[PDB]
Amino acid sequence: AEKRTLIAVIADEDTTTGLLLAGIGQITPETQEKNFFVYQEGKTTKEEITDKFNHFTEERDDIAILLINQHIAENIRARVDSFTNAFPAILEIPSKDHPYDPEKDSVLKRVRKLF
Amino acid sequence: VLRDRMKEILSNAEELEQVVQLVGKSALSDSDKITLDVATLIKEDFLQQNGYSTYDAFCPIWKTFDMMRAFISYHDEAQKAVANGANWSKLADSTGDVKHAVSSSKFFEPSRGEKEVHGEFEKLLSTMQERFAESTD
Amino acid sequence: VLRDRMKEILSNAEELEQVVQLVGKSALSDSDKITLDVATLIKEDFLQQNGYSTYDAFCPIWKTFDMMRAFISYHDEAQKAVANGANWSKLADSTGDVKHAVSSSKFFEPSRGEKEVHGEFEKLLSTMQERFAESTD
Amino acid sequence: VLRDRMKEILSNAEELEQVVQLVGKSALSDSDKITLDVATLIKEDFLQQNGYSTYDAFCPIWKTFDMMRAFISYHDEAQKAVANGANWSKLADSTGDVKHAVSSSKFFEPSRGEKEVHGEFEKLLSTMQERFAESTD
Amino acid sequence: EGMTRKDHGDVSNQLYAKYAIGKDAAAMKAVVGEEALSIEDKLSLEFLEKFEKTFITQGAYEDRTVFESLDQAWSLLRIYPKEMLNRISPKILDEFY
Amino acid sequence: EGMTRKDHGDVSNQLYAKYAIGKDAAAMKAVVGEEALSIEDKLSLEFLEKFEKTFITQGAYEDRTVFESLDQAWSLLRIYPKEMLNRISPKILDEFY
Amino acid sequence: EGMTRKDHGDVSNQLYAKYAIGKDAAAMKAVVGEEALSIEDKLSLEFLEKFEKTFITQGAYEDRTVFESLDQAWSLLRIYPKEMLNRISPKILDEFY
Amino acid sequence: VFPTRMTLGLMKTKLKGANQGYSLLKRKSEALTKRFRDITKRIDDAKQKMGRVMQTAAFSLAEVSYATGENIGYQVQESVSTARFKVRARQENVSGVYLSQFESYIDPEINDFRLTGLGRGGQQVQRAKEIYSRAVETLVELASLQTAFIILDEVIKVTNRRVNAIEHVIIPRTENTIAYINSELDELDREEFYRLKKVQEKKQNETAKL
């Protein structure tokens, strides 16, 4: 039952802002920290994504779905794959400026061996 | 040569089915799919009998030799054809007449090419070569 | 009519017992849970026998029928609720009071209701019906 | 003390192993692996003592004490290490050469060190304590 | 009465039943996994360990009185609440719980 | 054949097969439920029940002739369509269904 | 010596001990699946496969020399680090893995 | 080791247990694997669907940002501190396993901000916002299958382990035990008769003799 209500994001600027207009993530008022992480490609470090991921999965116990741009999941690949829980669900979506590759998607990788 | 290959095909067929359960179809492809299919045709032609015909109960040494020759020739050429670009369903539909005619060799007379020699098998080899051209292209 | 249904509940229980061990409890439907649950009531009250003669270990045959009547009247209601919609858990909360009574049947004596059966058991059949109507709605 | 513990460590190891085999190791703590891991070192190092030399065939009371003392000490320290932070794999990987250093002590003669206690076992205690700090880190 | 309690028969009955379930559950843990197990079974696993290491562990020269032995039996039994204990008549249960 | 119809041997193949599948399917129902149970097995689950309760349950002094017995058989198989009674000839099946 | 190595017996002890371990690791592969297996089992899995088709497969009119078998053993046995190869002494081991 | 007399009744039932277990858990497995395949295909398609619709709306917002002047998106992120689309989680039993599912509810806390109105530049953000809300809501509903899919992913691995574990370790152990004690047990009944018979012959011979 209910224990998770937010949908969070790790995505590039135009992708993140748009998700917010649609009305899915928010910033907590008590901690002063976002439940989205903005990213810009080549410009913002691989390390910061890795922390923010930990903030969202393990320190937030209220994130229901963690959405993540495929290009971005590919930078911190170990971190996305190694988390096998559905709590949060990890949903890799094709990153802006890139098509759908079925093997930049962590759940599908796992699916292939043993049906 | 032909007998050893008979044993191998049955052993393999069994083994690829287990993989389809545990591993999945991701370990399955069309080369394997032809392997399952040759074993099915071998079971029906060899293993199943009950004396429906008189020619289904006496089949000479030379006739038995001729049935296994069709099926192994189908196998190797189907695999070659899917590698130069073809699909299982496409191979299956295309082989068709020959595939039907060779299954039905048990109902057919064994005195067709003399008295022990069956003519249909001798004419299969040539059909198979022209057929392989239809399946690839 | 009662005797055949008591065995029946217990039969299904053995089948259930193997699934319960292996898979767990997290897979059985609402109907199946009840079967085990009414089975508990019979195991508690009939198979156990408290004392030499203390705790009213002596049950006359007519009292025994009444003990059984209370459980199977409960089973049929219990089977209808889940089927007409009511979670196993919800149905257990709502049954409450009538369930405790049937559980408590063995300490009671029939010599203070009539002389061989209990006025308390007659009252129990009315209470069952009333409970059921509230709980279903 | 060491004999009490010697019994316990092998008996706990056996029960755990049944669950790893059947269910898996992936449904079971890092800690339960640790008991098995230390237990294994005792299995090769003690049990095989058939020897290929007099050095690997003889084991005085002092030497027998020493090899047991280093393994129990490893267990106690390893469970701490993982518990305050440190994965399993990292601990296994780190101790590495040390696991081997005790393994090889049997091959070397006991007339070495002070008496019948190797300088290699004497040093081995310091190396153990030095290792727990790094594993933990 | 006067040297043993009236609860004494009841007390033995409780220990067997829990001790038995605990054993049965430990076996299923082994083959299939902890998907078969339930919360009740956890109480039971926990109950096996408390029984073995407290009740059955004692001296070779450490003698006891019967009253003490029934008092220690009780200690183990405190972990199930009243509603899951039904190997004692409820009348007796309210006194000694 | 003369006092028993020709369909006896054929019908026995179908009743036996379904009955087998039917035992297995009930065990499966218990676990999976009916939200992911197979369709072929769902009809076989209901089939297990009728096979017992009418073809195997009879009176004390209830007597049934062989012709009659054969008819009842087809009635139990009548629920399945033709595509799940595929081990029988369309001529016989089209007459007897 | 002079026809056998003294190492000949020692080499046998690695070969037998690994074969067994390997055989156990294959038993776990069948059950648990590779993903679940740890690093130690994977090496050993690999050793077992190589052992069957190369060591115990030879011709039926094909002779072997004892020297020759041990040299074949060393390559096959070479699939483990020095920590794990410890059923032979560090002197002989340092030379040949 | 194994019991001297009559393990056989027990071992018979052990044999039965093992064998039923393998069948049922392979059926449970069979249903999970069958459902999973179908869900895998839905998901591959859906990922392309979500990506294309999300990006079309992405491109519309990006043009808008540039035309309006300045990087609008930083401003919007701070200002927003509540969410419309949340989920309330529910358990659904599919194939005897309990999964987590998500059901969206749309809260009307926010619908217009203070950045979707600016005047002329504001009318552009507004046209963008509307494509993004429609596109995203669909994406949230599709995302619901994912959560369940991941739990399915986990459960198939466990369930497969078990079918194989009953098969290899338990059943042949049970064969080996049952045979050894059956043969011992039979040996007792036959040797007993043989010893008694051999002695009788002597006793009979003596009486005839004297």
From Swiss-Prot, chain A:
It is a peripheral membrane protein. It comes from the Eukaryota. SUPFAM superfamilies: AtpF-like (SSF159468). It is found in: Vacuole membrane. One of its GO terms (molecular function) is proton-transporting ATPase activity, rotational mechanism. It holds the Pfam family ATP-synt_F. Its main location: membrane. Keywords: Hydrogen ion transport, Ion transport, Membrane, Transport, Vacuole. GO terms for biological process: endosomal lumen acidification; Golgi lumen acidification; proton transmembrane transport; vacuolar acidification. GO terms for cellular component: fungal-type vacuole membrane; Golgi membrane; membrane; proton-transporting V-type ATPase complex; vacuolar proton-transporting V-type ATPase complex; vacuolar proton-transporting V-type ATPase, V1 domain. V-ATPase is a heteromultimeric enzyme composed of a peripheral catalytic V1 complex (components A to H) attached to an integral membrane V0 proton pore complex (components: a, c, c', c'', d, e, f and VOA1). Present with 4050 molecules/cell in log phase SD medium. Subunit of the V1 complex of vacuolar(H+)-ATPase (V-ATPase), a multisubunit enzyme composed of a peripheral complex (V1) that hydrolyzes ATP and a membrane integral complex (V0) that translocates protons. V-ATPase is responsible for acidifying and maintaining the pH of intracellular compartments. Belongs to the V-ATPase F subunit family. PANTHER family: V-TYPE PROTON ATPASE SUBUNIT F, VACUOLAR ATP SYNTHASE SUBUNIT F. This is V-type proton ATPase subunit F.
Swiss-Prot record, chains E, F, G:
Transmembrane segments: none annotated. This is V-type proton ATPase subunit B. Belongs to the ATPase alpha/beta chains family. Non-catalytic subunit of the V1 complex of vacuolar(H+)-ATPase (V-ATPase), a multisubunit enzyme composed of a peripheral complex (V1) that hydrolyzes ATP and a membrane integral complex (V0) that translocates protons. V-ATPase is responsible for acidifying and maintaining the pH of intracellular compartments. It is found in: Vacuole membrane. It comes from Saccharomyces cerevisiae (strain ATCC 204508 / S288c) (Baker's yeast). The gene is VMA2. Present with 131000 molecules/cell in log phase SD medium. V-ATPase is a heteromultimeric enzyme composed of a peripheral catalytic V1 complex (components A to H) attached to an integral membrane V0 proton pore complex (components: a, c, c', c'', d, e, f and VOA1). Interacts with RAV1 and RAV2 components of the RAVE complex, which are essential for the stability and assembly of V-ATPase. The lineage of its organism: Eukaryota, Fungi, Dikarya, Ascomycota, Saccharomycotina. The chain holds residues 389 to 485 of 517 of the full protein. It comes from the Eukaryota.
Curated annotation (Swiss-Prot), chain H:
It is found in: Vacuole membrane. Its main location: membrane. It is a peripheral membrane protein. GO terms for cellular component: fungal-type vacuole membrane; Golgi membrane; membrane raft; proton-transporting V-type ATPase complex; vacuolar proton-transporting V-type ATPase complex; vacuolar proton-transporting V-type ATPase, V1 domain. GO terms for biological process: endosomal lumen acidification; Golgi lumen acidification; proton transmembrane transport; vacuolar acidification. Present with 8500 molecules/cell in log phase SD medium. V-ATPase is a heteromultimeric enzyme composed of a peripheral catalytic V1 complex (components A to H) attached to an integral membrane V0 proton pore complex (components: a, c, c', c'', d, e, f and VOA1). Interacts with RAV1 and RAV2 components of the RAVE complex, which are essential for the stability and assembly of V-ATPase. This is V-type proton ATPase subunit D. It comes from Saccharomyces cerevisiae (strain ATCC 204508 / S288c). The lineage of its organism: Eukaryota, Fungi, Dikarya, Ascomycota, Saccharomycotina. The chain holds residues 8 to 217 of 256 of the full protein.
